[PDB]
JSON list of C-alpha atoms in Angstrom, two decimals:
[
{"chain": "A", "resi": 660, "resn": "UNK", "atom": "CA", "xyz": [2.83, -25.83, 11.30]},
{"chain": "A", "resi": 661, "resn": "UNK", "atom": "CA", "xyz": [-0.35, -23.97, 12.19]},
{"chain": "A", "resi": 662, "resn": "UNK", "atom": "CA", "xyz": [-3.03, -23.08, 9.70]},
{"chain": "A", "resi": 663, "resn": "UNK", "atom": "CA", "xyz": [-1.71, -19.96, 7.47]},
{"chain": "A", "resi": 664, "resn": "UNK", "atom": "CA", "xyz": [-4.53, -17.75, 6.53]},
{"chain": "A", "resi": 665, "resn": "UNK", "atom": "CA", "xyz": [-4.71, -16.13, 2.86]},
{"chain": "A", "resi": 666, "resn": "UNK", "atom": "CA", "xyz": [-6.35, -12.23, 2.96]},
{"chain": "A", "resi": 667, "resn": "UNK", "atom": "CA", "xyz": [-8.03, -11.60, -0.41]},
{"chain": "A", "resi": 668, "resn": "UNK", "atom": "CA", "xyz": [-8.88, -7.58, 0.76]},
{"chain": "A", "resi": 669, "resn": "UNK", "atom": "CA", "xyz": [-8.61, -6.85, -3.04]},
{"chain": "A", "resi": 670, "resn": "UNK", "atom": "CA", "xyz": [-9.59, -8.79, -5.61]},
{"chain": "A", "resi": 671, "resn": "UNK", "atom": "CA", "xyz": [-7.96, -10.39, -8.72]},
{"chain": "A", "resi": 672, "resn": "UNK", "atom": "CA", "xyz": [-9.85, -8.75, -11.11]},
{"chain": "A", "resi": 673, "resn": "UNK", "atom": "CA", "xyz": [-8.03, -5.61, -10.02]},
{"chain": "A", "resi": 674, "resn": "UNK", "atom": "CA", "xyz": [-4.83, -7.02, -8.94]},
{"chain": "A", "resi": 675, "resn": "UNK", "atom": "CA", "xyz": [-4.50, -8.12, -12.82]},
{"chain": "A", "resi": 676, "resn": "UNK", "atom": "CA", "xyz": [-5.81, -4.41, -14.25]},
{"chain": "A", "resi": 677, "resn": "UNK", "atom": "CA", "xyz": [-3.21, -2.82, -15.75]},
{"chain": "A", "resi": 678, "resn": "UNK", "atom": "CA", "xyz": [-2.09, 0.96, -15.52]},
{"chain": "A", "resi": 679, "resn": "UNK", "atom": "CA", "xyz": [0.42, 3.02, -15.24]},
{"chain": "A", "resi": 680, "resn": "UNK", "atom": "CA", "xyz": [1.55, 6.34, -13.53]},
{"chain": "A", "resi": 681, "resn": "UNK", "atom": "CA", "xyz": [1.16, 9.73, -15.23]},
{"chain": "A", "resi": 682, "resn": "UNK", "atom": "CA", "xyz": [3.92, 11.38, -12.64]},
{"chain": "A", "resi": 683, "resn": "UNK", "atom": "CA", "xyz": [6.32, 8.11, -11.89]},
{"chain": "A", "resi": 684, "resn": "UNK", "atom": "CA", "xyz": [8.29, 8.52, -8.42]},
{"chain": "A", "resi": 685, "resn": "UNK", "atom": "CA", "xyz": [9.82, 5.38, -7.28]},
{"chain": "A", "resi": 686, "resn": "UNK", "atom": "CA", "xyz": [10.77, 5.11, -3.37]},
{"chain": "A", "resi": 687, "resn": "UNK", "atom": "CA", "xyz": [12.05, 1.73, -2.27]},
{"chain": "A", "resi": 688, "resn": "UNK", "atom": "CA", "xyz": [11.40, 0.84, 1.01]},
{"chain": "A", "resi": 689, "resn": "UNK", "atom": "CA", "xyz": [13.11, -2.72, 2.06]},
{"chain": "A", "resi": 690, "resn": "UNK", "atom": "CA", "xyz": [11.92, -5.68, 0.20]},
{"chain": "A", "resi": 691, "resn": "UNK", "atom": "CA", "xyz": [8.94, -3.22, -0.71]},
{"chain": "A", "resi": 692, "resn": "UNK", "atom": "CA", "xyz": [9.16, -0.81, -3.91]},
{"chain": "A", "resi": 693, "resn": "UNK", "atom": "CA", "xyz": [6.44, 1.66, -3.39]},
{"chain": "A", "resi": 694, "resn": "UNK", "atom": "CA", "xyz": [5.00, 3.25, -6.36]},
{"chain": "A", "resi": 695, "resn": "UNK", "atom": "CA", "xyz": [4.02, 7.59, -5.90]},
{"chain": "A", "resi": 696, "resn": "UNK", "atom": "CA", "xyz": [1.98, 9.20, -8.62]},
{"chain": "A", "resi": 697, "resn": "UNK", "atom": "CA", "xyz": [2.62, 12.86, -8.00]},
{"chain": "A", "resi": 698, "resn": "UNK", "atom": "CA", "xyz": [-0.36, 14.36, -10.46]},
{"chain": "A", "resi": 699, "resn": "UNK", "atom": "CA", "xyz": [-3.29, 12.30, -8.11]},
{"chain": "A", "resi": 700, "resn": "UNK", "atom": "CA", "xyz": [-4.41, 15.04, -5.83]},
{"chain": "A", "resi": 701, "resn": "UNK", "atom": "CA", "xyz": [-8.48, 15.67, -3.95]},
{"chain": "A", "resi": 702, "resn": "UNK", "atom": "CA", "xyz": [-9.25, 12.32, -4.65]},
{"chain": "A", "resi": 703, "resn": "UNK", "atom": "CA", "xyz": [-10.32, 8.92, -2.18]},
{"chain": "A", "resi": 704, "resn": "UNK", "atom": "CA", "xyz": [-7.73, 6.07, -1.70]},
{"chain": "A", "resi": 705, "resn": "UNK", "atom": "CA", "xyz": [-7.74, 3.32, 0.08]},
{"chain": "A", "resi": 706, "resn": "UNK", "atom": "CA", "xyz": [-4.74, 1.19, 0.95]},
{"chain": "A", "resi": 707, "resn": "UNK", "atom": "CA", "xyz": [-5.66, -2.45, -0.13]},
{"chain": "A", "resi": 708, "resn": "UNK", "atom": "CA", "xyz": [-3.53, -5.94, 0.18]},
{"chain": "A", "resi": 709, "resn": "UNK", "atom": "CA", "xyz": [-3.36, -9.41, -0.70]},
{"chain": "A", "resi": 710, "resn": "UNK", "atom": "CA", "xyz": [-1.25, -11.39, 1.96]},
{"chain": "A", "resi": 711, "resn": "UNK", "atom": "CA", "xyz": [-0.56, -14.36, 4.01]},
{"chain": "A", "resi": 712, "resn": "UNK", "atom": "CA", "xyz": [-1.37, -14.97, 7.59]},
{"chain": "A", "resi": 713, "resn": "UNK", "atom": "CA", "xyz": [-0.01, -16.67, 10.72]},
{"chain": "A", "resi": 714, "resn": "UNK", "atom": "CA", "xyz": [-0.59, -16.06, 14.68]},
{"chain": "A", "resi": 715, "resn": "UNK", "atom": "CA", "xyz": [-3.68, -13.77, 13.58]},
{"chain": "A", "resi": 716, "resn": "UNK", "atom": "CA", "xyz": [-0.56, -11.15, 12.07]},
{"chain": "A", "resi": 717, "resn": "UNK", "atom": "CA", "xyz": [0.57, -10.25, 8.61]},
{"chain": "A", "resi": 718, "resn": "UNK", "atom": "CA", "xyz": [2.74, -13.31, 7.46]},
{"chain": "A", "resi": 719, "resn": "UNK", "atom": "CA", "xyz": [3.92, -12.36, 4.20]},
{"chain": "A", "resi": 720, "resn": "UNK", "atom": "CA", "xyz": [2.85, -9.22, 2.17]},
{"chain": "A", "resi": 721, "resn": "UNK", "atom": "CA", "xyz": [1.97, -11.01, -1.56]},
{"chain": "A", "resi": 722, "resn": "UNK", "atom": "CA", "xyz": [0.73, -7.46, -3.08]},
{"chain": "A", "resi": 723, "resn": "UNK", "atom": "CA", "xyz": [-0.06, -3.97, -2.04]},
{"chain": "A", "resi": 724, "resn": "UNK", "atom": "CA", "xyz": [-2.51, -1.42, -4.44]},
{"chain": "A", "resi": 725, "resn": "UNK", "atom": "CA", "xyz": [-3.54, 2.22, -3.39]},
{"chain": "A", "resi": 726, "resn": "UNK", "atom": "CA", "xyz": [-6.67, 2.85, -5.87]},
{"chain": "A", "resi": 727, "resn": "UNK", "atom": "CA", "xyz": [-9.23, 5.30, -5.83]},
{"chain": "A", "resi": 728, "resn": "UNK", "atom": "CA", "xyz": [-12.86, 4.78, -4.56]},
{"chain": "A", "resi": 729, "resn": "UNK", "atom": "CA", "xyz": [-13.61, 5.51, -8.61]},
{"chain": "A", "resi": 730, "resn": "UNK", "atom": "CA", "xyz": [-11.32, 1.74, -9.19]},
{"chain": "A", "resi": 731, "resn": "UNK", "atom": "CA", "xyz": [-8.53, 3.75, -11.08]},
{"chain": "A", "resi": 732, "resn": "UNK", "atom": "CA", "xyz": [-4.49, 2.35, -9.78]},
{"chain": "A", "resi": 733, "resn": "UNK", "atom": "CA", "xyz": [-3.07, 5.16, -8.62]},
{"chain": "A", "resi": 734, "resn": "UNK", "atom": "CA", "xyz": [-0.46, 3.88, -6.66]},
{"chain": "A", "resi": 735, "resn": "UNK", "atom": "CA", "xyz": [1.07, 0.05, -5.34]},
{"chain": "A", "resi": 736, "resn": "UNK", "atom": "CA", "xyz": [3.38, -1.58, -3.30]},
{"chain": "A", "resi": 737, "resn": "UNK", "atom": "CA", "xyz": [5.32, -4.34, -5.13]},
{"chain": "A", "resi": 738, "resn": "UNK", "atom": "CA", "xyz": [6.81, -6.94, -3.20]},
{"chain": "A", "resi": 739, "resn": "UNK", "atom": "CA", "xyz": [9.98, -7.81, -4.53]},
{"chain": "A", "resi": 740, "resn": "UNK", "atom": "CA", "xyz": [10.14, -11.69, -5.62]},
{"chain": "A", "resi": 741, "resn": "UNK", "atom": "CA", "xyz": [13.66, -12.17, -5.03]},
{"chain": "A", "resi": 742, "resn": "UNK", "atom": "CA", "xyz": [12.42, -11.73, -1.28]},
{"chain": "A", "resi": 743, "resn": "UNK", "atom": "CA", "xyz": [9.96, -14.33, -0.15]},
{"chain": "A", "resi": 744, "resn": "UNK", "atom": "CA", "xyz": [10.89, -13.83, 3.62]},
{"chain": "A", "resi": 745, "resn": "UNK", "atom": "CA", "xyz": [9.97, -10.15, 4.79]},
{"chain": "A", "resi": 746, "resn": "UNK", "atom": "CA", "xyz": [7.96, -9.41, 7.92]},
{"chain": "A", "resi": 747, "resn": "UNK", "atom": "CA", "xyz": [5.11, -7.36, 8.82]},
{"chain": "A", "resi": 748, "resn": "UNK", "atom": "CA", "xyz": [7.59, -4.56, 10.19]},
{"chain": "A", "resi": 749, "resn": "UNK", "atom": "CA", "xyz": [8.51, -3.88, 6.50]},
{"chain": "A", "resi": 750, "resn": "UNK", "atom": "CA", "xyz": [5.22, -3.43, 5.01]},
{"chain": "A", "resi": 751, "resn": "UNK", "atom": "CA", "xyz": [3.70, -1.18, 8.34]},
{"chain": "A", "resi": 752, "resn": "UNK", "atom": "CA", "xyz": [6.71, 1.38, 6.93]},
{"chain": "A", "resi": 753, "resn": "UNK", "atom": "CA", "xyz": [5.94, 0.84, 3.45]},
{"chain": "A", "resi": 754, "resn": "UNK", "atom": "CA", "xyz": [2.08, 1.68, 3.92]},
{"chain": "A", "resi": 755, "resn": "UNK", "atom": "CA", "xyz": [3.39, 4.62, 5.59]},
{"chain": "A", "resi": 756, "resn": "UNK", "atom": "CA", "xyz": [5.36, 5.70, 3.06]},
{"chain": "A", "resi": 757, "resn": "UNK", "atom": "CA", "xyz": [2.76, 5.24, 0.20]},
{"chain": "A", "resi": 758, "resn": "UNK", "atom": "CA", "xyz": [-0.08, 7.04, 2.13]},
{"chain": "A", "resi": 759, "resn": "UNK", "atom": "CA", "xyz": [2.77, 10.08, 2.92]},
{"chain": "A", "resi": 760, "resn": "UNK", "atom": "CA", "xyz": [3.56, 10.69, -0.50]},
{"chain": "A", "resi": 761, "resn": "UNK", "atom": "CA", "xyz": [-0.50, 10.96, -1.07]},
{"chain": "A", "resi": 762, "resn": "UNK", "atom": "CA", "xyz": [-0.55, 13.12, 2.13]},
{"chain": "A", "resi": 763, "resn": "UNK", "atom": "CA", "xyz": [2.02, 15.37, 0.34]},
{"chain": "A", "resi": 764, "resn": "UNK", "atom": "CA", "xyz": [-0.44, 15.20, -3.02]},
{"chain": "A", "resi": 765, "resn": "UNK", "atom": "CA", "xyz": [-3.50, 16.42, -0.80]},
{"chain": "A", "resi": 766, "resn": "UNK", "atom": "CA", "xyz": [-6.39, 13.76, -1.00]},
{"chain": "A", "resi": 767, "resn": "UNK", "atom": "CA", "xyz": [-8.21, 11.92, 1.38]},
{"chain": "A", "resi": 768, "resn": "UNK", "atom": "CA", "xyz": [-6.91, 8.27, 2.37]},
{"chain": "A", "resi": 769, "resn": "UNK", "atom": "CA", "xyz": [-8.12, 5.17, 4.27]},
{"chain": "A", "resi": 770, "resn": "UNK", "atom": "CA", "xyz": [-6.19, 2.21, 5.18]},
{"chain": "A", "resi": 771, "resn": "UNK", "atom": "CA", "xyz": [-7.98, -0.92, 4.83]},
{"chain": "A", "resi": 772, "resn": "UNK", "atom": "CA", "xyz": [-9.74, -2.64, 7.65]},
{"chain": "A", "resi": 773, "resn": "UNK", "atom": "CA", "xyz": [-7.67, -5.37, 7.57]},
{"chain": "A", "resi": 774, "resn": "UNK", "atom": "CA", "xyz": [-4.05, -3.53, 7.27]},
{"chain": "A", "resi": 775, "resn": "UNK", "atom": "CA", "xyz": [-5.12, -1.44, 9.74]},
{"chain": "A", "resi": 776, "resn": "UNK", "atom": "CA", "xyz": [-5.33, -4.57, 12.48]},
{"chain": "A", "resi": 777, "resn": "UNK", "atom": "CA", "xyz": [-2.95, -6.84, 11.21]},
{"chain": "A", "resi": 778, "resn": "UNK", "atom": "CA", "xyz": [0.48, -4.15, 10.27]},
{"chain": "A", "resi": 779, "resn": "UNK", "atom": "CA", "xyz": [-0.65, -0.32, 10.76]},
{"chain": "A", "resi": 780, "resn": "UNK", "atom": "CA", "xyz": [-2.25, -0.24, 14.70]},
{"chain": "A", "resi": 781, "resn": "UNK", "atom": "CA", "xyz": [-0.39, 1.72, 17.39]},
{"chain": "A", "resi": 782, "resn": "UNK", "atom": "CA", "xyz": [2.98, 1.13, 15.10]},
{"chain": "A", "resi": 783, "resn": "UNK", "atom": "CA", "xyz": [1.48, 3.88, 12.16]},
{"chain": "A", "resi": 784, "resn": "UNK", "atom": "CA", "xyz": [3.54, 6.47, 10.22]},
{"chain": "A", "resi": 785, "resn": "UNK", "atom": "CA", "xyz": [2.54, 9.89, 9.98]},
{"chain": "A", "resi": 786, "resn": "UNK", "atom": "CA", "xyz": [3.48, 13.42, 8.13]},
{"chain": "A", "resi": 787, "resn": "UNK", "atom": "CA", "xyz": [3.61, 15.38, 4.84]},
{"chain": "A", "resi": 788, "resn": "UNK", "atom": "CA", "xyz": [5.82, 17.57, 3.54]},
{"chain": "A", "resi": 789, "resn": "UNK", "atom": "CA", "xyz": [3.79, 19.95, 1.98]},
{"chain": "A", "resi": 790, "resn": "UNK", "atom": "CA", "xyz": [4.83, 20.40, -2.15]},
{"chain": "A", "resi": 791, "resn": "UNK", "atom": "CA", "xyz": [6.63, 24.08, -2.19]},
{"chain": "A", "resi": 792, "resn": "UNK", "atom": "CA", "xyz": [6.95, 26.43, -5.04]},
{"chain": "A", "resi": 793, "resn": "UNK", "atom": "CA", "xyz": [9.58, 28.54, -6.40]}
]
């Protein structure tokens, strides 16, 4: 087997911090559940993950957190246990689905450098249905 590679973008520390969402909308996306906080609006998020590696490409996605450059959890991306064999076309959607409910919310997101070259690239999803009243 060649040498799998183990992406520690975010750290423990974090990874173990626990939180919880004010205005809870559950998507599930795949193997992926992805976690949207409706109330977090104006502020700067950045997509982080912890995953494993193989051929230079997202191997298997261990954890996914969208936090705020303040620290605070505002959203994640839960890998399901029960599936220990997704691929990297799973979570590129699933990122994509995370950052478009914050899109919808109106703030101001960044994917992380390393999600950005290993799942996101050419193969990223885009739009926001903007929140309409009565």
């Amino acid at each position: 087997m060649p040498a799998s590679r183990y992406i520690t973008d975010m750290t423990i520390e974090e990874l173990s911090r626990d939180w919880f969402m004010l205005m809870p909308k559950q998507k599930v996306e795949g193997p992926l559940c992805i976690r949207i906080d409706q109330a977090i609006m104006d502020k700067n998020i950045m997509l982080k993950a912890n995953f494993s590696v193989i051929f230079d490409r997202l191997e298997t996605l261990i954890l996914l957190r969208a936090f705020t450059e303040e620290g605070a959890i505002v959203g994640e991306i839960s890998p399901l246990p029960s599936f220990p064999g997704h691929t990297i076309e799973d979570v590129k959607n699933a990122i994509g689905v995370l950052i478009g409910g914050l899109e919808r919310n109106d703030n101001t997101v960044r994917v992380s450098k390393t999600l950005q070259r290993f799942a996101w690239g050419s193969s990223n999803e885009n739009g926001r249905p903007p929140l309409t009243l009565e």
